Subunit: 392 residues, 3 copies
């Protein structure tokens, strides 16, 4: 006869896990939380900042059980990392909710491991949607909540009253590292995209419209005679870009993506910034007081991702990324005094195998590395030649 979150949480708490990490860059230990995304494969999502530069990763269920997990993907720009429990048995995954249907009155409960106390649940409401600006280089479209979140909560669950995941708790505004009522989670639609890519590739293949923009504030709107105090202002479109081809002109205002009204430029960036190349989308446009509708196809890019370090753990040097279809890992750009080039690593190289195993993409590669061989025999192609690079 008493209302309670207990019935819901009982089904849901098994989904959320604690995460302990040992690493170096100087030895450190860290801890945070994670969410089980696929029970069968033992996929567990979490903040990239928690598991970044980790030598060892251990995951602990609510029931006590510990497992070891290995990395499978990580995206610093959005701060989402995907890991995988080695030898997953009898797990519970969380069902994801559609974060786009969230409203500010909405109740939320947060679950995670503050200060490593153990699985802690706290609750609140949605204080705000679309918050960004925390770190302006990243994609950020944060849900804001006043459910209590502290250090150790990172990577944990933000769920609604039905126990569906709506976000991953990531950061808090807080002088003096204590919670004051303001915390942020990555909306779950973003997690759904980013992770699904990582699963299949080991990284995110970032698509772009190829427009330069900025927040459409009220002042700018007068300058431009537009009826609209919010949106993405198109400063200019790149030549031979999706936008270009689609007919978007500079001095346009983007008001909606795929039906969904657009909070701001950042939100827009964040949305598309997480869709995979080749995605077909449609833009709500506003040029000279007239509404416009345009169909676009997300295209390639020059995304700065996956350094040689994120895959070798400590081997500074050239950045790397997949290549075409499952064609192997390509080395982007080697530095100079960077240890990687100090093993013969030269930009333009195409890692096509390792230790007699085929490498189609970064996931496969990281897989050979998971076995932790003593000597790593890279099978690369420079120009029209096969060569081998060795490590220890």
């Amino acid at each position: 006869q008493m209302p309670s979150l207990a019935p819901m949480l009982e089904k849901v708490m098994p989904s959320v896990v604690s995460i302990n990490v040992e690493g170096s860059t100087q030895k450190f230990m860290a801890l945070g939380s994670g969410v089980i995304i696929d029970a069968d494969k033992g996929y567990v999502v979490t903040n990239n900042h928690v598991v970044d530069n980790a030598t060892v990763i251990k995951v602990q269920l609510s029931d006590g059980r510990k497992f070891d997990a290995k990395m499978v993907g990580k995206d610093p720009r959005s701060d989402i990392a995907l890991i995988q429990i080695q030898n997953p048995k009898n797990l519970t995954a969380i069902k994801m909710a559609d974060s786009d249907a969230l409203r500010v009155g909405d109740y939320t409960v947060a679950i995670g491991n503050p200060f490593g106390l153990g699985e802690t649940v706290t609750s609140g409401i949605v204080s705000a949607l679309g918050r960004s600006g925390l770190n302006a280089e990243n994609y950020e479209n944060f849900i804001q909540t006043d459910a209590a979140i502290n250090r150790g909560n990172a990577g944990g669950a933000l769920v609604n009253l039905n126990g569906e995941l709506i976000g991953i708790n990531t950061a808090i505004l807080a002088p003096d590292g204590g919670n004051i009522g303001i915390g942020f989670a990555i909306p779950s639609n973003m997690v759904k995209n980013l992770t699904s890519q990582m699963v299949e590739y080991g990284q995110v293949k970032r698509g772009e419209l190829g427009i330069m923009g900025t927040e459409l504030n009220s002042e700018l709107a007068k300058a431009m005679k537009v009826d609209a105090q919010r949106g993405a202002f198109v400063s200019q479109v790149l030549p031979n870009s999706s936008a270009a081809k689609a007919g978007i002109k500079a001095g346009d205002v983007i008001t909606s993506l795929n039906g969904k009204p657009i909070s701001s430029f950042a939100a827009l960036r964040a949305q598309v910034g997480t869709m995979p190349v080749g995605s077909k989308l449609t833009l709500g446009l506003l040029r000279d007081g007239k509404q416009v509708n345009v169909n676009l196809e997300l295209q390639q890019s020059s995304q700065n991702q996956v350094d040689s370090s994120s895959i070798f753990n400590g081997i500074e040097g050239a950045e790397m990324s997949n290549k075409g279809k499952d064609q192997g890992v390509v080395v982007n750009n080697v530095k100079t005094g960077t240890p990687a080039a100090q093993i013969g690593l030269k930009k333009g190289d195409v890692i096509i195998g390792a230790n007699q195993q085929a490498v189609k993409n970064i996931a496969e590669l990281r897989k050979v590395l998971d076995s932790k061989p003593s000597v790593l025999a890279l099978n690369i192609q420079r120009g029209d030649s096969t060569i081998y690079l060795l490590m220890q």
Copy 2:
């Protein structure tokens, strides 16, 4: 099928605004929140401490729109200021609730601009009623809540589940300027009185009963053989005061105002301290174990208000206040080295016009000043003479 504050907030959030302020006393910037009280006239209430000593005031709606606002009234004793949006179009005002019907179990939601993040809502309950003592010179009858309130929330809304305004968020107990679960709002009945006066006059005409008192604590009650552990103890009544005339004797205990039981002396002070002169009220009295009922009429006073500075912005000197009916602004008491008297400002002067505009009260005056003339030509009366005082 899920409970949510969203439906209510959707109607209500437009009412609450952000406030940016530029000032000097040395240049500063400040920010807080405000509530739209009248949609047509663009009246917006807020904490006096937010907009105090401001050269510029800009208000930003939830939809993005910015407007400029000018001051119309301010009361430091209660920390309520009233401002007005210049050129108000298509606004939403909040409906006010009767704060006297609040109870401690009651749910509350707070809306405002913590750290200038944007319109943030957080929720809690009524922790307590009638809290005072924060600053003992002020009138204070604070609602206390554990909805999260931080810097930037000041001047914002405290509403109930029906979206009616019950208070204005004002202060927080908090070492280290972060919220810990204890925040305070001015009850809305007080806001309703204080503001309505300001609208019509530019200041509050403070009435007094003319009794000296103190909190009736349990110890004092024994000393005095009274059955009552709380109330206002009458230490003495002033001669030719309302109290006097009404038959109130020293050593009386006031237990109720207008039917409403009385928390304490402070609460009493705070209540009447916000009713306009001439108000007719009735007091619940307790003399020698016997209940008494008395009818009173709030009378004049010597209220220390509106310095020449609050209207000239930076012109230290004599204090000022309305006079009789709409008879003009009277200069209370000039200092010495104060810049005001350094323009020929002498106590007893009665500003009856400015720049060929008639001045009936402080609002009218502040109105001529809103136009920001280069030279201000005051039309004053000293004794039986009209004179003119000039400024720049």
Copy 3:
């Protein structure tokens, strides 16, 4: 038509009280809260750490009334103290809920006196059950909640939506002494046991099973081939102990006490650590993959409790404790330079009266002391001799 905690709180708030304390060890003042446990006798429960080393204790009702209270019992190991309002009139006691039926989704409201503001209520949920480790020498089986708790809340009520007491607020995790969403209360079943003893004896007669143990973590479970990631691991059983007699063997795992599954070793310790000697209980055992059921009888012990100081307020020296039935207070072990032995206090002494009043146990004793005589005439037995020890 609006949901509210108000109706419930209206019945319940009278039960909770504020507590002011004057003491020395150097003069100090302290404050916290307390809960009325028995309206007739004026019993009020609170944290031992609040009223510890107090010369004076005053209790203040929600209605204003102040009373003086005297100590009747105190248990530092669990941090529960029991006091009694001198001359209790017209009080309201709280009904206690069964803390064992609490679940993590559950709503909670906290009531108490943060920073001596007065009776403050805040609310939250059960974040966690069975938390311990705060101070590892104590018995601790804390409920964890995110209802706001700050300094002054200690000794106050944690209740459910029906206004039944489920815990006593005790501590908070918090850098910088401000609440961040994590606070702890002693579950109410523990309070019910500990206090009831104190009432009847002045101390707690601690029973033991006589087993050494430790937390059964997942690693240890592999080492031992047990299917169970949580519980109490039996490292060894003491000879001639209850456990011994009952058939418990080292390398056993305890999974349940009296039907109730067992969080951990600490929880177990904490449970039995609060049952009175002679209690009959039953243990859920797990030896070599096989479930076992055993019946036990709590037995004596060597519990380190009640120093001569806790009863004399400032008279360092030998520890003391009841003896057999109501046989008087026995002096455990005298130190050396300790002031107690400096009045002729010798271990093995059996205080059988004081000032011509009979002393059956520590409560009676503390009673003669409550009258605050100028000279205290102890009637002791050393060996086969009656003697008298004098004080001032």
